Amino acid sequence: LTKQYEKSENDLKALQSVGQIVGEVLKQLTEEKFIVKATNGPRYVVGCRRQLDKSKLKPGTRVALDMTTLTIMRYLPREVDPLVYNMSHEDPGNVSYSEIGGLSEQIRELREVIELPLTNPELFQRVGIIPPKGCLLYGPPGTGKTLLARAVASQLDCNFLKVVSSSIVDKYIGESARLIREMFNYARDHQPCIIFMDEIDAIGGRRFSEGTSADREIQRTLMELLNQMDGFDTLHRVKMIMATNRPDTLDPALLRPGRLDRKIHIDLPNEQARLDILKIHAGPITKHGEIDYEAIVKLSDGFNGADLRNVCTEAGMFAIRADHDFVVQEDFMKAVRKVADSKKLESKLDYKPV
Amino acid sequence: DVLPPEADSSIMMLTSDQKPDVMYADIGGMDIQKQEVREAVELPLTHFELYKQIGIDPPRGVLMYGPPGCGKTMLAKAVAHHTTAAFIRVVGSEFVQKYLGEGPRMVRDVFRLAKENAPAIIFIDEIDAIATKRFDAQTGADREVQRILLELLNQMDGFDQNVNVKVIMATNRADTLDPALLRPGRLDRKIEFPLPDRRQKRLIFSTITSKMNLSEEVDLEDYVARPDKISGADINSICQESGMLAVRENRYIVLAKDFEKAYKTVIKKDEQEHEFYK
Amino acid sequence: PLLHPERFVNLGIEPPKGVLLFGPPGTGKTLCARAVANRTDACFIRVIGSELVQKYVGEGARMVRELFEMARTKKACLIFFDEIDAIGGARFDDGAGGDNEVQRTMLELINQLDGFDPRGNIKVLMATNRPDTLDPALMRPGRL
Amino acid sequence: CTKIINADSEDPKYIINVKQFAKFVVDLSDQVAPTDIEEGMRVGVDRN
Amino acid sequence: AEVKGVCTEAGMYALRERRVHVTQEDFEMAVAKVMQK
Amino acid sequence: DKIKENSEKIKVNKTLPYLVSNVIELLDVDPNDQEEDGANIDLDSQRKGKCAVIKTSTRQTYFLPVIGLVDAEKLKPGDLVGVNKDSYLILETLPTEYDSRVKAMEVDERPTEQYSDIGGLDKQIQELVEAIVLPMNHKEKFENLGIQPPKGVLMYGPPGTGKTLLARACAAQTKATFLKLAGPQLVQMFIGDGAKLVRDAFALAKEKAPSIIFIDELDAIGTKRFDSEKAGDREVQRTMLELLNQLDGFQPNTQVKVIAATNRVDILDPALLRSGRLDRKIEFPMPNEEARARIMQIHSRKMNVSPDVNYEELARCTDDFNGAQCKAVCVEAGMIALRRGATELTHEDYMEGILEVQAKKKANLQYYA
Amino acid sequence: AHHTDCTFIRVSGSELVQKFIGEGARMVRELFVMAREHAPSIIFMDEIDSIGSSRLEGGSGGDSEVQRTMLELLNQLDGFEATKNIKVIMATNRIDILDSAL
Ligand SMILES: Nc1ncnc2c1ncn2[C@@H]1O[C@H](COP(=O)(O)OP(=O)(O)OP(=O)(O)O)[C@@H](O)[C@H]1O
Ligand SMILES: Nc1ncnc2c1ncn2[C@@H]1O[C@H](COP(=O)(O)OP(=O)(O)OP(=O)(O)O)[C@@H](O)[C@H]1O
Ligand SMILES: Nc1ncnc2c1ncn2[C@@H]1O[C@H](COP(=O)(O)OP(=O)(O)OP(=O)(O)O)[C@@H](O)[C@H]1O
Ligand SMILES: Nc1ncnc2c1ncn2[C@@H]1O[C@H](COP(=O)(O)OP(=O)(O)O)[C@@H](O)[C@H]1O
């Protein structure tokens, strides 16, 4: 008949297939005896087919097995642990470094840590100095540390990884360090990788002494990340970026150089820094051509890099009132005084560097 | 059937391509402890009868400690390259899995692997995850942590008083530990890795600055003069940042202004005191 | 209301589902509670005031959840609380490193008592000897 | 005994877990009608 | 408690001299090194 | 007939008790050098299609060469599939199920409250409609000016002024998937389980694309993070840092609108007052004069009221009250008429309700004036 | 012990015994049995018992089957001796954690 016939015979063909057990090979016993471990539990000794290229079956590899006879079927690449899949190819597209403004000094210092050693590795060799491994961002909130990470993410898109730093913990005594094992093993397999560890202050912190058995697991997740940072096996083409709001509460073993080579400071924006931020955010606004940004930037001191985006948002709200369509500079002066009214119940951040 | 004596261990040796290529002469200014760790590992292989005719009761383990970044992991990394005996390295917090008793089971698998293979050197970095004095807080998780210590303490006592499985382990805080780990019949030999002094700063600076250019207009002893509580890792960060600064100016030659900007970048967060107190 | 749901329907009012008892010790609050549980024609559920204070974090909110769900399952039950100062009346922050978990339990109670689809035809009795160190959210009518 | 989590439409097709054994997709027997079979209560399941 | 460490590290310093002897200068350096810590 | 017999044989094999499982990742197997005839195998080199690896519900991960009666392109790692019991072959793709606590908080009762019952606050109801109702109804009006939709509203004040009315009002009007969340529901037993809870909470709001999430009593989880001890605060700060990143920052979303409420704001972290977390800060003062006379008029709508009462005298006499206290005046006044049995009210019914609400203790103040 | 013409028994007993949780409940049993059957002797026991238990706060907390060990030691310390042939000496540090008032 039509394709209903051809779909049916492939449907009946597929049902005769069976599953296969997944296991790992410990060592090679003889030319036909192989000791394997099923990952759910018990270990066995098995044999190959005849032509599976037994030189390739190395200790530690992953391989499939049959059900009844339990013999070696086909070697497979290393596992990916689909929690790691959810943080690898998940980021939507972002526009480039044009939207971020006023941080051009801190922009270039991150470029020299990440992009330059992989694009131009010869020039560091010519001097003969190993490039730095990782960098740390810190500062008051709302100045764009996460947006800076989005700018680097949509720049070459090498192997960018987004750690939430709160799903690292779990309900069991294990499975927290074991996820960090599979993350860096995924980092070793794909060599030019970038790890982004946002909000480290959850998992990180200081070293206690007989606090709580709950803190013992959070610490056991902590100094494991210290160990896989430098440890025994050094890293290659792996750069880790981490950001927080309080750098004083971090561990001194976390903040020592070698694991965090350069500390990057992001501060509250200056007069010209608040000016061109406002130029970017007021770009797609159908304003009437009388707007003067100089008076607007004058009554905004101590603002973040994000309250100015709220200022641009609130001016359209006053345009929405009586549906005036065009935005008039009087609404910009009115919306500024509304925002600075709200910025009086959250202050005194000023955390000590490093 | 009877297998060959190590078949399932689920942990392998340091192979032959995993040598981390750190030379002994790469380490500068550690001869008070490089020589100590050399005589505490390979020397009692031959001279074992000299302990018995004097009565020192030769040690099995040595525990390193110090401020975080004085050179602890690299010395263990250094002796992995220049050993002829087998070497086994394990993560200090990898036997914490979510089953019943796989922790003590794989700890027994390590020492069985270490005994039957060779007179090997077992290195277990960061034991603070396991070696806490603590107490039996009835939560459902601490009992496996304690019995891992009990399995570790039972197996470090009675090998034969002749097998040359040397044990080496290292922390940064050697205070939150059970006192039986620092007791005889177990890991006894004590070495501290303190912050360097003026002479050892010269040796670390000369070794690191022997591979890039250093045009002769750069003084080296003038940066040694300010004490500033400089660790081992701060020297490498100074040389990297000064090199990266010269990279940024499209220059392959390190100058004296590069070291000054590196010195301000690495160490400036110390000036916090009020004038009227003194 | 639990025996004559005829007067309030024709007069169109609502009964005060929360009543607080207070006074000097040994005056009859326990006797009034037993007298209420005498002729209740309903299900009576007593609460020890320090039962909710527990060692692990967050379990007291689970007791309040299961308690109000058991209240919602049957028809027209009566909650009795005794010694409400143990559950919590203060809102201290003067270096707020002291009690916070029992504040979370009180907050989950405070939320389940009122607002966003309220409980229904249940009533709440409370009793304490010092009704001056209590939460102003508790003293707000609609709950007490 | 078992715990139900999700119910499908038209056809019953309930997603279920036992306590720690496994999770399944099952049907109700002819002994009971499909009315008091809502999500979030324990239900007994034949072992075969 | 430090006297035991004095004797063991005195034996250590005697062993570095490649002798079965335990000399006086071994004890002097023993006191100095143990006292230092 | 010939094809329908094959259609009959397919439905025979899929009986009903399918085990469920998770898909780990999808693979693809290349052919080998030369497969020997007389010892060849179909489930090998001669399969250029797709493949998958599946972890079962019994924590045993198996492998399958043929995916089966599912299109391969629809499957993504992290999904749930209805595999068999013997061949362990994929049969059906199920809707993804969530945590049992997450499955309970969907607003299904659909309450009904109009805006006229919150008389006294018409300035605050103007912007609260503005920051919520306009984006999911008029996308084209905001897009013509083209700036950004709002993100989050904080409502706060003294606890009697009335804030849960406006939360219940917006669930009454909008036909979006309103979602209800409490403060201390997020604080859980073990470590973890709050990070999983908020992530599951936002995931349920993703598929129901017009949705409002409401968080009540934000001062429970969301206290000021400082240098302290113990594990009680550190678990809450772990869930707060999970909340802030999933709300604004990486992966921005328009389709989820968050509403937060509290009674104190000095305790909240300043990171809650950032860009997209809390957009507007809304006050709720105590009712002054005409709001108090408006409140008693609203609540006494059902009650039989004698038509010689003037509410301005009540509003003048009742001082330092709120919405709930003026509500309690009306209920108490209606009972006093029931005590004497009179149907319609009077002025002195209200005044005795006033004297009960103030809760004045025994005085002995007879040495004044 | 040597000058009183008695044998000396030293009890290590810190944590290697308590690995099989209730072995302490037999540790204080059989030891005392040998100290009752061998000779006039003394028993030397270290700080560890105070490390093992302080009081019965673990009676409502769990006892980790160690305070019960202390409890077992308690009755076997009481028993009926009146010197007889068994005596005990306590050597310890930080005396103010255990329950010497009872
Ligand atoms: N003597 C030395 N000479 C040169 N560099 C050194 C020396 N000692 C340490 N370093 C530097 O220290 C780093 C190696 O790790 P590090 O010595 O800090 O580990 P560690 O002492 O075990 O520290 P931690 O306990 O913090 O993990 C490298 O950056 C290396 O340049
Ligand atoms: N009006 C009363 N008539 C009869 N007995 C009374 C009366 N008031 C108190 N009692 C007696 O007082 C005894 C103890 O008082 P009760 O148990 O009521 O304490 P309470 O008022 O609840 O106080 P508290 O909870 O502070 O201890 C009761 O057993 C009861 O017999
Ligand atoms: N302005 C008002 N007009 C009419 N009724 C009001 C007003 N304000 C509050 N109410 C009454 O308050 C009751 C609901 O409690 P309310 O909204 O005051 O609590 P809240 O402030 O949101 O919460 P919380 O007690 O947690 O602070 C309802 O019975 C409602 O009629
Ligand atoms: N330099 C800047 N220029 C323009 N907008 C900025 C800038 N910095 C921050 N923003 C605004 O702040 C938001 C990002 O906030 P967030 O990532 O929370 O900052 P942080 O993580 O540093 O607190 C963005 O939506 C962006 O609109």
- Contact list in C for residue F328 (CB cut-off 8 A) is 16, 141-142
- Contact list in A for residue F61 (CB cut-off 8 A) is 22, 39-40
Residue A243 · residue A137 · CB < 8 Å: yes
Distance CA F268, CA F266 (A): 6
- With a 6 Å cutoff on the Cβ, whether C142 touches ligand 3 is yes
Decide the pairing of beta strands F80-83 and F18-27. antiparallel
Distance CA F254, CA F242 (A): 19
Distance CA A128, CA A137 (A): 27
CA distance, residue A326 to nearest chain B CA (Å): 46
Angle of CA points D22, D25, D31, to nearest 5°: 110
Q: Which DSSP helix (H) or strand (E) runs through C101?
A: helix C101-113
- With a 6 Å cutoff on the Cβ, whether A300 touches ligand 4 is no
- With a 6 Å cutoff on the Cβ, whether F165 touches ligand 3 is yes
Task: Write down the H helix ranges in B10-141.
Answer: 31-39, 49-52, 72-81, 102-117
A92 is in an annotated binding site: no
Chains E and C are in contact, defined as 3 or more C-beta pairs closer than 8 angstroms: no
- With a 6 Å cutoff on the Cβ, whether F334 touches ligand 3 is no
Instruction: Classify residue F111 by burial, with Cβ atoms within 10 Å: 0-12, 13-18, 19+.
Output: middle
Closest-lying ligand 4 atom to the alpha carbon of residue A280:
4
The verdict on F19 touching D (C-beta cutoff 8 Å) is yes
Read off the tokens for D3.
Answer: 């715990």
């030369």: which residue's tokens?
F34
State the distance from the centre of ligand 2 to the C-alpha of C38, rounded, in angstroms. 16
- SS3 for B189? strand
In this structure, the residue with its CA closest to atom 6 of ligand 2 is C28
User: How many CA atoms are closer than 13 Å to the CA of B134, on its beta-carbon side?
Assistant: 25
Read off the tokens for F355.
Answer: 């004297």
Q: Which residues pair with A262 in a beta bridge?
A: A135
Query: Does the beta-carbon distance from C141 to F324 stay under 8 Å?
Result: yes
Instruction: Classify residue A4 by burial, with Cβ atoms within 10 Å: 0-12, 13-18, 19+.
Output: exposed
> A309-348 burial by CB neighbour count: b if 16+ within 10 A, else e?
bbbbbbbbbbbbeeeeeebbbebbeebbebbbebbeebee
A140 is in an annotated binding site: yes
- With a 6 Å cutoff on the Cβ, whether A278 touches ligand 4 is no
CA-based nearest residue to C129, from C29, C18, C1: C29
A134 is in an annotated binding site: no
Distance CA A250, CA A197 (A): 14
Read off the tokens for C135.
Answer: 């939460």
CA distance, residue F181 to nearest chain C CA (Å): 10
Strands (E), chain F: 18-27, 51-56, 61-64, 80-83, 92-93, 153-155, 177-181, 211-215, 256-261, 280-282
Four-point Cα dihedral A153, A154, A158, A159, nearest 10: 50
CA-based nearest residue to F256, from F174, F183, F186, F179: F179
A141 is in an annotated binding site: yes
- SS3 for A277? helix
CA distance, residue B37 to nearest chain A CA (Å): 18
Angle of CA points B119, B124, B125, to nearest 5°: 140
Angle of CA points F81, F82, F83, to nearest 5°: 105
In this structure, the residue with its CA closest to atom 18 of ligand 2 is C28
C-alpha distances out from residue D4 to C69, D17, D35, Å? 18, 7, 14
Farthest CA pair distance, chain C: 54
CA-based nearest residue to G28, from G41, G11, G46, G51: G11
Residue A327 · residue A316 · CB < 8 Å: yes
Residues 6+ away with beta carbon under 8 Å from F306: F344, F345, F346
Of A64, A80, A141, the CB nearest to F63: A64
CA-based nearest residue to F315, from F331, F296, F302, F301: F296
Mutant choice from B79, B96, B132, B263 vs A, greatest count of A C-beta within 10 A: B96
State the distance from the centre of ligand 2 to the C-alpha of C32, rounded, in angstroms. 8
Identity of the residue numbered G29: R
Distance CA A151, CA A241 (A): 13
Q: HEC string of A250-270?
A: CCHHHHCCCCCCEEEECCCCC
Query: Does the beta-carbon distance from A128 to B142 stay under 8 Å?
Result: no
Question: What's the first-to-final CA gap in chain E, in angstroms?
Answer: 13
Identity of the residue numbered C139: M
- Contact list in D for residue F19 (CB cut-off 8 A) is 22-25
Identity of the residue numbered C44: F
Chains that touch A (3 or more CB pairs under 8 A): B, F
CA-based nearest residue to B245, from B229, B233, B261, B234: B261
Distance CA F142, CA F149 (A): 7
- Contact list in C for residue F227 (CB cut-off 8 A) is none
Distance CA F185, CA F243 (A): 13
Distance CA B150, CA C124 (A): 54
- Contact list in D for residue F16 (CB cut-off 8 A) is 13, 25-27
Could you tell me the strand order of the sheet in which G86-90 lies? G7-11, G41-45, G86-90
- Residue of chain B with shortest Cα separation from A108: B248
F223 is in an annotated binding site: no
Neighbours of B257 (CB within 10 A): 13
- Mutational test site, ligand 1, from B125, B236, B240, max ligand atoms within 8 Å of CB: B236
Strands (E), A128-261: 135-138, 160-163, 193-198, 238-243
Distance CA G28, CA E16 (A): 46
Read off the tokens for G102.
Answer: 């009872």
Distance CA A324, CA A329 (A): 13
The verdict on G66 touching B (C-beta cutoff 8 Å) is yes
Q: Which DSSP helix (H) or strand (E) runs through A34?
A: strand A34-38
Residue G62 · residue A213 · CB < 8 Å: no
CA-based nearest residue to F14, from F84, F101, F74: F84
Residue C114 · residue C79 · CB < 8 Å: no
The values of phi and psi at residue A129, to 5°, are -135, 130
- Mutational test site, ligand 2, from C29, C31, C84, max ligand atoms within 8 Å of CB: C31
The verdict on F18 touching D (C-beta cutoff 8 Å) is yes
CA distance, residue B135 to nearest chain G CA (Å): 9
Residues in contact with ligand 2 (CB, 6 Å cut-off): C 25-31, 129
Neighbours of B160 (CB within 10 A): 6
DSSP code per residue over A304-319 = -SSHHHHHHHHHHHHH
CA distance, residue A242 to nearest chain F CA (Å): 14
Rg of the Cα trace of chain D?
Answer: 10
Residue F261 · residue F219 · CB < 8 Å: no
Strands (E), F140-210: 153-155, 177-181
Of C107, C115, C137, the CB nearest to F220: C107
State the distance from the centre of ligand 2 to the C-alpha of C124, rounded, in angstroms. 20
- SS3 for F93? strand
Residue A185 · residue A219 · CB < 8 Å: no
